[PDB]
Amino acid sequence: NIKTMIPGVPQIDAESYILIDYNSGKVLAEQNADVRRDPASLTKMMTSYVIGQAMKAGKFKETDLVTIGNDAWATGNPVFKGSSLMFLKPGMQVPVSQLIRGINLQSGNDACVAMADFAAGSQDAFVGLMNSYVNALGLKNTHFQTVHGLDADGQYSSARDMALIGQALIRDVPNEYSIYKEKEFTFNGIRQLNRNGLLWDNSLNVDGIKTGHTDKAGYNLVASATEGQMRLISAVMGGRTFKGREAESKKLLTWGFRFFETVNPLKVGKEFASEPVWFGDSDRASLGVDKDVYLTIPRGRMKDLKASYVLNSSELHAPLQKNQVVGTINFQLDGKTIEQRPLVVLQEIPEG
């Protein structure tokens, strides 16, 4: 009864939420996770992702100077009224490093425009890239219209999609992601703090990601935290206050770590099984996986994890290509399969 208990999910004071394991992708808890909502400043997570991809590709460096044009002039564009701003002015020459902290830490809407023009030539072209990555990441309930999320009546996202964008930031552009844990930066002699109050919560190891709030959106937060090498991501959208979005996210993250653990039973290239092969330059095939296996299981139950496999075909016949799928690995707890992964040929076996 205790060994097999399924924990109850805490009550969460928000319109929608999700909690996922970064490594395994397992959804630990969810409510209304696919409902389309106003992302508010969470849009800037995708702005950051695009910029991160550009820097990873070597298109520009953090020390490069960006010239501010009239479109990023904070007090020359009333669309920016009442929003977070660096107070950029035309003709300033600001390092990429400062602008990306403006976007990431301050949600500076002017900074978003300046970087969009720098990275992609125009705001429209940059939004094109944002939406291209929406497609590349397989997000079903997300669409962007502007680089900052202002003036975007037809933009939307969801708790799931914002958690998945978080996952992508951490996984794909780690140098960009590393900025989100910074508690402050200085621009024009003015120190600017991070709005993610969970960075100061000494009871968790939170290192990201993004907050947002409007009247339509309510209070939004995408958070990520670690306990050792285990990492969870929470997205809470339509929270009720500044303090509530933090508190509700903390509830989810803490619950996740208490009841679940991530395990890595198999890495790419490690032989899991072997089987005879016919017609080959070797007599047996080495079989395993083509992507590292991470599972999320009930905490404490690693000892009870069992694995076995099935083969698609009666016989293996050479030629066998590297990563050729030949079966399925079943991971089991309490005599029930909880996870399956493709079983693949680890080394090509040509005909003899």
Q: CA nearest 62: which of 110, 103, 122, 106?
A: 103
Residue 210 to residue 168: CA distance in whole angstroms: 14
> Is 26 annotated to bind ligand?
no
Is residue 124 domain-shared with residue 56, that is, in the same domain? yes
- Cβ neighbour number for residue 128 with a 10 Å cutoff: 13
DSSP output for 151-211 = S-TT-BB-HHHHHHHHHHHHHH-HHHHGGGG--EEEETTEEEE-S-GGGG-TTS-EEEEEE
298 shares a domain with 282: yes
Biggest alpha carbon–alpha carbon distance for the chain: 74
Site of tokens 């914002």: 162
Residues 264, 282 within the same domain: yes
Helix (H) or strand (E) holding 177: helix 174-177
Measure the CA dihedral 46/50/52/53, to 10°.
130
Q: Are residues 254 and 276 in the same domain?
A: no
Domain stop point among 203, 225, 259: 259
The answer to whether the beta carbons of residues 142 and 158 sit under 8 Å apart is: yes
The span from the CA of 272 to the CA of 265, in Å, is 10
Provide the CA 2 distance to its chain's centre, in angstroms: 33
314 class by beta-carbon count within 10 Å (0-12 exposed, 13-18 middle, 19+ buried): exposed
Asked if 67 and 89 sit in the same domain, the reply is yes
- Domain range for 245: 1-259
| Angstrom distance (rounded) from CA 121 to CA 130 | 14
| Residue of 16, 24, 26, 44 marked catalytic | 44
- Same domain for 266 and 218, yes or no, is no
Positive or negative, the CA dihedral 202, 203, 208, 210 is negative
Task: Specify the residue for token string 């709030």.
Answer: 213
Separation of alpha carbons 270 and 292, rounded Å: 10
Catalytic hit among 41, 48, 157, 249: 41
* Residue 6, preceding peptide bond in cis (omega within 30° of 0): no
**One domain for residues 234 and 308:** no
Could you tell me how many helices (H) and strands (E) the chain has, helices first? 7, 17
How far is residue 24 CA from its own chain's centroid?
A: 12
Catalytic residue chosen out of the listed positions 24, 48, 84, 107: 107
Pair 186, 106 in one domain: yes
By what method was this entry solved? Answer: X-ray
Alpha-carbon span 206 to 166, nearest angstrom? 13
Q: Indicate if the alpha-carbon torsion angle 324, 327, 332, 338 is positive or negative.
A: positive
287 shares a domain with 248: no
Distance from chain centroid for Cα 120: 23
| Domain closes at, from 208, 228, 259 | 259
* Same domain flag for 171 and 147: yes
By CB atoms closer than 10 A (0-12, 13-18, 19+), residue 252 is buried
The count of other CB atoms within 10 Å of the CB of residue 310 is 11
CATH of the domain at 188: 3.40.710.10
Q: Are 223 and 269 in the same domain?
A: no
Q: Is 203 a catalytic residue?
A: no
Q: CA 345, 346, 348: angle at the middle one, nearest 5? A: 75
DSSP per residue over 122-151, as a string?
A: SHHHHHHHHHHHHHHTT-SS-B-SSSSSSS
Number of domains in the chain: 2
Among 319, 313, 328, which residue's Cα sits nearest to residue 352? 319
Q: How far is CA 28 from the centre of its chain?
A: 15
Residue 259: CB atoms within 10 A of its CB come to 17
Q: Which of 242, 259, 276 is the last residue of a domain?
A: 259
Dist. CA 287–CA 295, nearest whole Å: 19
Active site residue 44: yes
Q: How many residues does the chain have?
A: 352
Q: Are residues 156 and 201 in the same domain?
A: yes
For the domain that residue 335 is a member of, what is the CATH number?
2.60.410.10
